[PDB]
Structures are given as structure tokens and as C-alpha cells.
Symmetry: D2
């Protein structure tokens, strides 16, 4: 152990840990469930502390060595060597006060070691005085939240979306000439090509990308600089703009300071809205994933128009039986995003006065949705999408058995003659040709020259 | 017109209307959307005013004629002749104050006419003084809410549920001997009978009934008697128990006075919980309705194991094409109940101190869900369920084409021989028999005596 | 009555009605609940039939008189004289087939009367043959859905939003100089002006407008032209673009034909996404409405920093008691939009193959949300927002009683002296001045010159 | 490493791990997010494998040593020494096939070591042949799901609920004599005692317990015995009842075999319904937690009627400022449960035919809700509830400042005189007494003897 100290007194802290007293004490008051802060949030919080250090130094508010050590300590968190120094549960103070201190304490104890070498009360860097300089838990957590979200969106989900789109766009191109029977209300309908159907999946993904991109500008607005209530009391007038510019410099993302800090602190609106676009993508992905599994159902008693890769071990006595596992993982996580959206909306609508204190819950759900969506699309693409192949013989079989093509005959034989063979064929269990020949309305050769599915699109 | 008067002054009211000034004034302040109070709520509100009149009279708090006229006026509302006297939107005061007055005013003006004959300021019955005697908008609306819900549950939804159950139970009984191929993950699986599958739908409906019944006792608790904050200030000690007994006498439902009026006024918990059972039934109905439509998909390119009644006009050129319209109405309303549940939960969790003021919205959603569920099951039963018929030839065809029966051979020929024909059959596109015969492992007669689907359940 | 006839036969229809047989028959098969198509959807459906007539005529597909009469009949629906000719419930066929026919039949019977004069089987205009020419229930309903939504958004909700924003922006401007104590976690915090707080409400509304506007382009895409499965079988190549241009000409909205008809028919993605922006606005409105009611709570035992207009009749014995009725209507409808979003998401994710058959439910929820939001903001603005007034004396009282201003003393007397008076004041129940004077650290005059709330923002 | 082997071939597995090939391979196909199976599910899965072993042995289906070693290996999982042997993500095959195998493999390799000693291909116990004997992933996962849920409900959540109830019931008893002003619509209302208000919180918790208990019987029904599709093909007729009895013997819970295995496999109805009761408790907890934070707001500019324990370190310059941290953690997790309910409902309504394949997601949400609820109530009780204390002087102050007591004067001086002092007092900013004395209607002594808040309940 090691006795660390805060305004309430001294408390025992594991010697091999970098956190201080406040983190240790919160660890006892909030022993709820098992959800902790996500790594991406922790790194976004480190990035925030680093940019803040750099700006403070620029404004002569922090000495060269003090600032340089905090930033250097931050890079270690980013390097991933302090993942185990953040034990706090998601279910803490609604402002994310604890996790802010947790970062301040780990960064203070470590920056101290990077200078003199005291981890503990005799440290050279103060968590509150130096690490948390020109800030507040009120404006730091919201900033970390936006940094984590924008970056997760820009380099984790969007790349995977564009990738799924390209694979499906190529599959669409390759199967452009394969005509199949359409289905409306789950009933046989007018034919269309396999590529046309898949092109629908592609159009959907392109539309979604568009909707996700419109929600980025609002998420790119940072609260850092509004301090406690948004007035920005006790901070350099240039601090807000400066910290935003620095964060943008290092992340290469379009971060800007929020034009209205009161809106930035009082709400989680940017994320409520951004998640609206995500549940939209989940509804799209659910339909695409559903189409795939149904299209691949069988091998004998389903639809079986396409085949997908069999990734899980099977049985020799069970040839052709392939459970659509990737489709099941994607549909399941799509339900999660829908649920997460309700949690986010309830927390986002519950702000009071100057601050919204439902933040840890909101970012937990939001980050999880991006993670699920991005990884789900990656897994779906790699283990399923690239392997979509048409069962051409099965597709032809179905096409020739349906009555939906009887429309192509009308231009030669009126509705009367056409509807005649479709009635008998259906009653006797005959195909359009079989029935047409028996009713002597035309020959096989004429049938085969009149019913051209490739011409009815 | 007719100038009616309230504490804010006099206001013009349509001469041919029975409502007073307060209703007229609210009509101008809450012009939001088009949702009004449901007829069932209005009748439950009338029943409440009637029972209150009867108890007041019993406690010598209201004269024989005054009480008798209010009750007689109430019966007219119940008789359905005053449906047009309640113009108020759902989006009013969260306590349902307006609609309470709306009832007080219509019942005062009418009870007046049932005595002397003055509809207006010179009326013989006072809305507040006589009609709203020993009550408050705070405890009257919650009572009307519970009266409307319990009754809608007991004689509108439960009867329809039991009816759907019986139809499906009989269909289950009739198809007990029809063996079909099962489907897990949408892939062909081990066989089961059609009656067994349908018995699953029945077990689900019986379970749901059970869950709906457990939520009734809490909804049967009435708030009437707690007045403004639950203390029951200014009401006869026997009033609460007496009004509950009277309501139970006339509705034949097990109404009782709420043991804790503070919980009764501060929350909508009974309905939040009751609606939990309703969204449960919706998830069950959605699955049953989905099974039906998929099982009936076709006529040629789907599953087509069963046929359902064609209720909508079709085309001669489109024989066998039957859209599962009832399944589409039921699945759509099941989504609505899910949505309604979220609205209900948000309002139910938003109570503050002594009173929950999200009531008009809560009962609007709850009543709509019961209405949708009860009517949906009635329509589904009548126009679909009773008409479920098996396409026996299609079912056999699928059964004999699948490879899932190769298991029945193992008890004669080892896994090695069995898996051999299943591999070839699948590869060459042959049935188990066809492949088995070609591999000379057994004869057609032996195959037909070994693979008995009626014995593998 | 009047015997109308369809492919299933003849059926009795009320003589005084304009609808035909199919509408009459659906009226019996879908007797579910009481929700019917909203007037805005019906008018959007009429606008669609009108533009389709005009384009058909342009392509020599419909004679001058036939086309002119259908359009003229459509304008009557738009003029609002046929509101009672659409009895169909929302809970019908998922494609909205019935309501499409309902429009075809009313427009056929009426256009007939506008020519010769036969309402019924001997009519001069055929619902299917002339009214439903070059269309399908599959592509007509989705078009009507988008027409109704975009127009409701552009001229019903956005105008009300901008209006609420301007009122609040002016209230913000007027109270810019009124300093009040801030509240974080519901605890007293650093001060800010009333105008700054309200400016937060304004920034939120401006952001929302921005988010709603980004969702319009996708909703402006029309499916009309894709026919049954999206291939656009049996329609003039120029039909799609032409009908879109015409609809844009008459509505003055930026309608365009959907680049991908398969996405347009297979999903309700545009509305799932658009509603995402609406639930975002509801979360914002809920917070603003909550701030108002809490800020106006009292008159004696709450916060009471502002007063709002008393629109409902009160009691002389209850002076100052004003229930925040508008805030209760707005918060209630905000919960509804949240619920509606879940219904919309479930239906939007349930599309199968070529068509989504959850449409009537989706547009019912979407249209209701716009209606609730637009009307709610109108009612809130008019009956509450414009009347927001600060209780300046109450605000000063609270400001001078709080300990939050002790920070302003530090620049004269160190933390030691400052924290001393804040400790005693809190313990003894004294103000900062009262305690400061007793501890002889400074004079009243010095206190009154050092603690300037107007300088700590 | 160590080369393990399955039907797809051999694969490299970490030598220091107990899992086999299938687990290793799934680990690569389902790299989605970071959610893994909860410890409680894993232990419920171990309990299932143990009871299955014991029954197999009883039916002479598994040798003494084979059975004894599997059970002994299971107890080690229960002892918590194999927590790190289950790497699988929640986002896997919808039936939970992988995690079932993951358990089979770890239990096979370990039971082998408990006999001869071969961890790997030359092991003495076969995962599929011995560990997964008389079972299927289809009926084993649903059983583990119900075992985990019932036990978490019975010994984790209910105990915490009853504990919170008792604390609040005692606080209610202790403050029974403390009269305070009520609040309806957030406006001052008729008075009630603090104990009466808190008794409302208690009544709510007692009601919830009741609702949670009604959902247990359905969750106590186990699917184990229905095998693949529910027919129970290839299992001892007594197997189902026997395994249920054994599980009940060891867990001491009322487990029984599901009367209908088709309903048990095709749906997650029991959990959809059980979670309905949980979101009900969350709406109740949200209100209680909200009442507390608002009641404790201040120290100067809020309500401040009660004080709560300050558990987080503060500032000397900030005396009396105590953020309601426990209330913020509880309200946040209540939003989560609401969200989780939507995820659960969507998955529960998406079952197809013989099996629901949304199970891993459903149990993940359900288990998390119980965990959050149970731990939240424990933390809230311990760190907040037991410390609720009334600010008696603040409560009196508010009581004497309000106009709500003017009603008590009417029985001496008519409405005219009473409403007179309430009007002036409100206008001049005087209390009822102050105004009453100035208007010479009565003396201070008479006022102090007529306005008795302890008598108006």
C-alpha cells in the first residue's frame, strides 16, 4: 500500500498503482456492476489532458518541465501502458468527476516520476493544481466524450462502412445479369436481377454514410473552456480556442470550440443526434443481414438462392447445412444499438439547469454502438459478404416454376389466353409452359421465345 | 353561444353544448394535434362521478335529487349519447384536470336539465360544488385511469386472447399427425408435427394470459380518497372504501381502495407494470404472426407449407398469390405496443414529489395498446387463424427432399454408410433414397421401411 | 346503398359515399382500433394522384378530359371537401394498398360525376385503369409518405421552431444583465446571467434546426416510378423524373426521383433517419420545458426565479399558485416522440426483400411526431415562452444568501480568511457579509465593493 | 501452443488453456467489441453440465468415473478458478452454440486431467460425446439462461430490494411526526408528513417485489430435454424431469421442466416478461432517487428539506455543497434498464420457427439489468438511504412562509376574510400571520392556535 491524501483525509492505496486517494475512495463508493470506462474514452481523456498541458505552457501558466512531463505521461496512456490504472465503474458521478480525477492522479504520480521520482504525497506534480489546471470535471468530461466519439466515427466506423459498401457494390456488379423472382409481402412477385437487389443494399449504405457525416460537425464542437457553468470563469480568454486548435493538430480531426458553452455543458444533444444516425444504420444493417440469411436458407427446405461461407465446424452427416452465424451476430448487435438509443435519449432529455449529469451512461452506450457497428461490419464483410455466391441452378428452377412470368405472354395472346394457362397450371400444379402446351395455345419453341425474364428486368 | 363563467371571468360557449367555461377555455390553450380522450376513459370517468355521487348521498353529503340527477346524467354518457361533449386533447395538464372539469361541467348542465332545466350559469347543479364533491383532479383522474384499464383488460383483451388460444389449440389438435421438417437458424432441421409447432403458439398465449392476470390486482387499486396529496384531507373517513365498493358493485370488477394513496398519486407504477405484460404479448404475437406469413409464402418461390384465407380482391392472372394482410396488421400494431411501452416508461419514471403529471399521455398509450391487441387478435382469429390449412403435398415434398432424415438409417447402416449417401445426394442433387439406391447400400423397400418420419417425432 | 363491384364480386356501399367496393370490403376486414390515415397523408396521396394524372396526359397516356377530371377531383380533396370519404384504419395491409385504392375509387367516382355523372359501376373513370395508371400500391404509398413528411417538415414544424427560437432569443437579450446563481448537480454553483442560460436554450434550438435540415434531402427522394419491385416495369422511361418534377412544381418543395428505387421500396430509411432528428429535438425541448417549470416553481417553497403566464382559472384563496400546464403538455408529447421512434425503428428494420410492409404504422408515428412537435412549440411559445418574466427580487435574495460568492474575496483576503467566513456563515446560518463582518475581516462597504456578481459572469 | 482438432481440421491453441479447437476458431470469427459472457451465465452453464452429468450417470448413460470427473471439473468453474477459460464474445451464434462448446471443451480437457491427465486430442473425456451427452446447444443455452436469471433474481436483486425497503420503512417511521409542505405540479400544495411521503417510496418497493415474484414461475421452467426442435429426440424419457429435479436440488430454487419445449425453444418470452417487471422497478427507483436529490438540493438556493451523506472529497471554501452522487448513479442505471428492455423486446419478438437465435444478446441485457439494479440499490442504501436526515428548521421555515395553510382559518373566519390575508400576504410579501395581524382579523395567539399543520395531515 501507500497512504495518499485528499480533502477528506488519507487513505490506503495499492503501492503498485499510479492513482491517488480520490480514485481509491470512489472505488469503494461506486461498486456497481462490471462496466468500466472504455479504452477509447480513457485515451480521449489523456489527449485532452495533453492538449491542455501544451496550451497552459503556451500561456505561461505551466513551466516547461511540468508541462512536458504531463504530456509525456499522457503519451504513455496513449501508448497503452496504463490500461490497468483506471478501475472506475461507469456508474459514478453523472459529470464524470471521478474519472477526471482518476486521470489527474495517474498523470500526476507518473509525471512526477518522469522528473524527480515521487509517486505519492511528496510528488512533484499536483493532480488538481497542475494536471487539472484551467479546467473542471464539468467541461473536461464533455470534451473527452466528443473527442472519443468523433475519432471513433472517423477512423473506426466510417472506414468499415465504406469497405462493406465496396464489397457489396462489386458483388452487385458481378451478378447484374442473374435474373431472379422478386418478393413483395413474402409472395412471388415480378422478377429483378440479383445485382439490382444487392444494389439496394449498397444504396442504403451510401445513404447512411451521408447521414453519419452530417452529424459530425456538431460532435466536433468541444466544451473545454466553459469551466463550471459555461461562463469560462478563471481561464485565459484564448484558452478555449487554443485547446481546440491543439486537439485538432494532434488528432487531425476538425475540432473547434463550441460557440455556446451553455448548450455544450447543459446537454448531450450532439450525441443524441449522432446516435440517431447510428440507429438508422442498424435498421439498414438488420434488413441486409436478414435478406442474406433468408436468401441462403436451406439447403433443401428454404429459399436457397445464394450460398455463404461456412465458418463453423459441421458434420459429414449434415452436408449443406450452414447456419448464418455472421448474420446472427449482426442482427443481435443491431437490436443492441436500438436499445442503446433509448438509454441515450432518456439521459439526454434529463439535463437540469447548467449541467447534464447522465454523461458516463451516455458515452458508454454511444461508444459501444460505434464499436459494435464498426466491428460487426468488419466481421460480416470478411466472414460473409465477400463470400456471397448465387446458386444459379436453384435460382432458375424457382424462376421457371413461378406463375409471375405469365405477363410476358399477353403481348401475343390476350389476357384471356394468358390467365387461362396460369389458372390451370396453378390448379394442376403445372408450369406456365407445361400448362400452355396442354391447352394448345402455343408451342414450346414459341413459349421459350416469348417468356424472356431477361427482358422484363 | 352562451356565456358561461369561471374564476377568470365569463366566456362564450356553443349554445348546443353541455360543457362549461373551463372546458371552453382549455380548448383554446391546448390546441395540440388531434388526439382526444378515448371513449373508454370518458366512460370510466362517468362511472367514477356516478359512484362518487351515490356515496356522497349515502353519507348525507348530497341531497337525493342532486345525487340522482348526476347519476342519471352519467348513465347517459355511458349510454353513449354525449360522446361529442368532450373536445379536449390528450395533451393538456398532466394531472388530467381539464378533462375532470369537462366531465363536471357536462354532468352539471345536464343534471340541471334533468331537474329544473337550466343549462348554464343559472343551472341547479354546480360542477365543482356538487359534481366534484369530496374529490380532486389529482385523485379522480388516476381512479378513472385504473377503472378504464382493468375493464378493458377484463372484458376486451382477455376474452379475445382466450378465443385465439382455443382456435389455435384446435388447429393444433387437427394437425397433430402431420409431420414436417423443423427449422433452426432458418436451416432444415429435425422433423416435428405441424400440431407440435402450433402447440408452441398455444403455450405462448396461455403463458401470456397468466402474466396479464398477475398485473390486475395492482391496477384494481383506486386512488379516489387521497384527494390532493394523498392525506385525504376533507373527505369522509369511509369515503375511500365506500366509493371503491360501489365501483366494484356496478362494474363487477374487484376494485379496492389503494392501501397507500401516496404511491397511488405519485406514480403510474401499476400501469407501467401492466404494460410490461402487454409488450410481452406483443413479442409473442409478432413471432406467431411471422411464422404464419413465412409458412404461407409462395405460392411457388417460398415455403408454402400452409395456406391462409384470401380476403382481399385479386387477379385471375395471379392465381395463388395471397398477401398475408392480417399478419401485416398484427405485426405493425405489435411494433406500436413496443413503442407505446417506452412512452409509458418515460412518463412513469418522471413523477415528482406528491403527483405524477404525465397521466393523460400514459393512459392514451396504455388504452391504445389494449385496443390494438384485443382488436388485432379478433381480426387475426376471424380472418386468418380459423382458416389455417396445411398444404399436405407441399409438406411431403419438402420432407422427402431434405437430408435431415439420414439419421434414421444409422440404426441399420453405420454412420459411414449413412453419411455416404447424404454426401453424394447433396453433391449430385439426389434425395436420400435416390442416392442410397445408386450406392447399392439398400433397396427402395428397405429405405421406405427404415426412414419413418412419423417415428422421429 | 349502391352495389359496387370488384374481382371478388359485388358488395353494398353507402349510396352517399364516393368510395368503391375494395374500400368497403377492407372496412370489414380491418376493424382495428380507431386510428385512421391522417389528413396530411390523404392530401399527399391526392397530390400524388394529381401529378400522376398530369404526367400521364403529357405522355399521351390519358385523354384530356379523363386527366382533367381526376386532377379537378383531387383538388376537391385538397380543398378539404372529401375528408369523410376515407374510413380506412391505419392497421391495414403493410404496403398501404387499401388506402391507395380508397383514393383511386373516390377519385374515379367523383371524376366521373365531373364529366357524365355516374357514381358507381357505370362510372366514366376507372379507379385502376385510369386513376391508378402507370402506378402500383408499392410505389404510390411510399411517394405519398415522403410528400406528406417533407411538406409537414418544411411548412409546419420548421416555422414553429424558428418562431420559438426568436422569442427565446429576445428574452435572452432582455435578461442579459440579470445575474443569477448557477446550478450543477442541482447544487448551488457559480453565477451566470439569466440571458446566458436562456441563450443555451436558443443555441439548442438552432442546432436542432440544423439537424432537421440535413435529413430533408433523403426524404425529398420519391419512389414513384419503380412500380412493383423497383425495376419500373411498364412505365414510360420519363415517367419517374416527370412525376417528381410536377410534384415539385406544385408543392414548391425540392422533390426529386429516387436514384435507387430498390432502396426506396425496400426500406423506410429516410424516415427512420429523419425521425432520429425529431427525437433529438424532443430531448432538447424536454430539458427546456423542465428548466422553465422548475425555475417557476413555488410561489414560496420552490425556486421561483421566473414567473410564467397563468392561463387556467384559479382560486382567490390560492394567490400565486400557477401550474406550469404548457410545460406539462410539452414534456408529455416529448415522451410520445421517444416512444414513436422505437415503433418507427422496429418497422424500418423489418423490411423483407423487395418491399417494406410496415409503412402505414411508420407514417402514422412520423406524422404524429411532427404534428405534436409543431403544435407543441406553437402552444408553448404563445401561451408560455413570450410571457417569461424574472422575479428580480427573488433572484437577488437567492444570490445574496448563497456561499458561492466567497470566491470573489480571495483576491483581497487569502483562501484562509475567505474559507473562514464561508464555514462560519454556513454553520451559524449567516450570509457571507454577516459572517465576514462578525469575524471583523472587513467592513460592509468593503464587502459590497469586493463581491460583485456582475463581474464573475 | 497445442494443436487441437475438430471436424474442420486441426488448429493451434494456447498450451496453457483448457479450451479446444471450436472455441479457438470462434475466437477468430467473432472478434466483435469487448462484451463477453457474464460470470453468472458461465456458472449457470457449469451447473447445467454438472446436473446433466449426474443424471446421465443415473440412467447408466455415463460411467462413474467419467461423470464424477466432469462434475468435479464443473465445481472448479463454480469455485471460480477457470474464469479465464471463456474468451468468447456475446456477439456469436444466436443459439449460444460456441459458448456451449467452450464449456464442453474446458470441462473435457480438465476432467481428463482429473483422471489420466491428457489435455488435448488424447484426452480421456470427449466434449461432444461425454460432456455434451443427451443435449444440444439449442436446449442447453436456454437452460443456462433461466438458471442464471432465476438465481440472480432470488439471491441478488430481491435481497437488496427488501433491504432498501426496510431502511426506508424505518426512516418513514422516524419522521412520521415531521410535517412538510406537499408539492403537486412542482407548486406548493397541501401539507403532509415526511414519513408519509417516504411511506410512498416504501409502498412502491413492496409493490415491485410483488411484481418481480410473479415473473419467477415462468423463468423457473427449463428447456433442457427438448433437444434440437423440442421433440426431445434421442434422450431418456425421464431425462428432462430428472435434470430439472437435480438442478433444483443443488440450487435450492424451484426449477421444473418446461411443459411445452416448443415454446421454451422458440421464444425468450419468460425473460421478456421478467424484464417487464424490472423496467417497472427502474421507473420506481428513478422517481425515488429524483425525490431525494431534489429534496436535498442547495445548500441555499434549492429546496434543502433533507440532507444526505457527503461521500466524495470537497472543499473548505465550499461548505454544505454536496453533490447527490448516489442518486446520479442510480438514475443513470435506471435509464440503462429502460434501454436494455427495448433490446430484449426486439430480440424476443424475432424468433423464427423452432428456435430463437437472439439469445446471447437477450441474456446479456437481462443479466446486466439485475446486476445494475441489485448493486445500485445496495450502493444507494449503504451510501445514501441510511443517512437521510431532515433539515427541521428549513422545513419549518418553508411551512410558515407558504400560503397553503390559509385553509385552516376558514372554520373561524369565512372564505372572504381568509382569502383576504392570502391575497395581501402574497402581494406585499408577508406570511399568513403577518398579513392577518395587519388586517386586524385576529391576533398572533389566535393565529398560532388556529393554523395547526399537524392537524391538516
Amino acid at each position: 500500500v501507500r497512504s495518499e491524501k485528499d480533502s477528506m483525509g488519507a487513505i490506503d492505496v495499492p503501492a503498485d498503482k499510479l492513482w491517488g486517494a480520490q480514485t481509491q475512495r470512489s472505488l469503494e463508493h461506486f461498486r456497481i456492476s462490471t462496466e468500466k470506462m472504455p479504452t477509447s474514452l480513457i485515451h480521449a481523456l489523456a489527449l485532452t489532458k495533453r492538449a491542455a498541458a501544451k496550451v497552459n505552457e503556451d500561456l505561461g501558466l505551466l513551466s516547461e518541465e511540468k508541462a512536458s512531463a504531463i504530456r509525456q505521461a499522457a503519451d504513455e496512456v496513449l501508448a497503452g501502458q496504463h490500461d490497468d490504472e483506471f478501475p472506475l465503474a461507469i456508474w459514478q458521478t453523472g459529470s464524470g468527476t471521478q474519472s477526471n480525477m482518476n486521470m489527474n492522479e495517474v498523470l500526476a504520480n507518473r509525471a512526477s516520476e518522469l522528473l524527480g521520482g515521487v509517486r505519492g504525497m511528496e510528488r512533484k506534480v499536483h493532480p488538481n493544481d497542475d494536471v487539472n489546471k484551467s479546467q473542471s470535471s464539468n467541461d473536461v468530461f464533455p470534451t473527452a466524450m466528443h473527442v472519443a466519439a468523433l475519432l471513433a466515427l472517423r477512423k473506426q466506423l466510417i472506414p468499415q462502412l465504406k469497405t462493406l459498401t465496396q464489397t457489396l457494390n462489386e458483388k452487385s456488379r458481378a451478378f447484374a445479369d442473374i435474373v431472379k423472382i422478386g418478393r413483395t409481402h413474402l409472395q412471388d412477385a415480378t422478377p429483378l436481377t440479383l445485382g439490382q437487389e444487392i444494389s439496394g443494399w449498397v444504396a442504403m449504405l451510401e445513404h447512411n454514410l451521408k447521414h453519419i457525416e452530417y452529424s459530425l460537425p456538431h460532435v466536433a464542437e468541444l466544451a473545454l473552456g466553459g469551466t463550471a457553468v459555461g461562463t469560462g470563469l478563471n481561464t485565459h480568454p484564448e484558452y478555449a480556442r487554443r485547446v481546440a486548435d491543439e486537439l485538432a493538430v494532434i488528432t487531425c480531426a476538425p475540432f473547434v470550440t463550441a460557440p455556446n458553452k451553455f448548450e455544450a455543458l447543459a446537454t448531450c444533444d450532439a450525441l443524441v443526434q449522432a446516435h440517431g444516425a447510428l440507429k438508422g444504420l442498424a435498421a439498414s444493417l438488420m434488413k441486409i443481414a436478414n435478406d442474406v440469411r433468408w436468401l441462403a436458407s436451406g439447403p433443401r427446405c428454404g429459399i436457397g438462392e445464394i450460398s455463404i461461407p461456412e465458418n463453423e465446424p459441421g458434420s459429414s452427416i449434415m452436408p449443406g447445412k450452414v447456419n448464418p452465424t455472421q448474420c446472427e451476430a449482426l442482427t443481435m448487435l443491431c437490436c443492441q444499438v436500438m436499445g442503446n438509443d433509448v438509454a441515450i435519449n432518456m439521459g439526454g432529455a434529463s439535463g437540469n439547469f447548467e449541467l447534464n449529469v447522465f454523461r458516463p451512461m451516455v458515452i458508454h452506450n454511444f461508444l459501444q454502438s460505434v464499436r459494435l457497428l464498426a466491428d460487426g461490419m468488419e466481421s460480416f464483410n470478411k466472414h460473409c459478404a465477400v463470400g456471397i455466391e448465387p446458386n444459379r441452378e436453384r435460382i432458375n428452377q424457382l424462376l421457371n416454376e413461378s406463375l409471375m412470368l405469365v405477363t410476358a405472354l399477353n403481348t401475343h395472346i390476350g389476357y384471356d389466353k394468358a390467365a387461362e394457362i396460369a389458372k390451370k397450371a396453378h390448379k394442376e400444379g403445372l408450369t406456365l409452359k407445361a400448362a400452355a402446351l396442354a391447352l394448345g395455345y402455343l408451342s414450346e419453341a414459341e413459349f421459350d421465345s416469348w417468356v424472356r425474364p431477361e427482358q422484363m428486368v
